[PDB]
Amino acid sequence: VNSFSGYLKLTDNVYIKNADIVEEAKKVKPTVVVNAANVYLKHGGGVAGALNKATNNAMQVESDDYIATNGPLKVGGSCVLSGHNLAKHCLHVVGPNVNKGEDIQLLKSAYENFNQHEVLLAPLLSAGIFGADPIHSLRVCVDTVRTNVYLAVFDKNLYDKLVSSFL
């Protein structure tokens, strides 16, 4: 039993809700919140901009030190950093950004990072400003993640389409 509330169950391990991931994290304080990161950990917009703003830019400060030491992530890769005031940990995961021409096949690799954590609060990878089809992203999530994932979908209209179109 965990403290996630109001989710629709899609499969044995995937749950979904129309919610703002920032507000969900502040309420639940999950062990792991997933950020929709880029390889430079430059948290400008979308989920990343929102999570960082909620940390008063502490996420960006920590991320800049991480990059200075380690260099950029790979598309499809991840790193674990602090969750600041939102969660114990933040798993920064880089899905492919279709608006950069990146290979959508890398979306499965991106979701594989979730399997290293027993329970996660997460967005749909490569959705929103990353330019991928969210229905496809949800499909890849369900077919790749085996650990317990609680998906927050910001847009109510998209959420309803995701639920009603889910196979």
Ligand X SMILES: OC[C@H](C[C@H]1CCOC1)Nc1ncnc2[nH]ccc12
Residues that bind ligand X (CB under 6 A): 20-22, 36, 46-47, 50, 123-124, 127-128, 152-155, 158
CA 129 to chain centre: 13
Residue number closest to ligand X, CB atom: 128
Task: State both tokens at 105.
Answer: 């096949």
Closer residue to ligand X, CB minimum distance, 46 or 72: 46
Q: Beta strand 119-122 with 148-153: parallel, antiparallel or unpaired? A: parallel
Closer residue to ligand X, CB minimum distance, 15 or 71: 15
Q: How far is the CB of 68 from ligand X (least distance, A)?
A: 26
Burial 72-111 (b: 16+ CB within 10 A, else e): ebebbbbbebebbebbebbbbbbbbbeeeebebebbebbb
Closer residue to ligand X, CB minimum distance, 81 or 150: 150
Q: How far is the CB of 123 from ligand X (least distance, A)?
A: 4
Q: How far is the CB of 72 from ligand X (least distance, A)?
A: 20
What residues have CB less than 8 Å from 28, skipping those under 6 apart?
3, 4, 121
Closer residue to ligand X, CB minimum distance, 155 or 160: 155
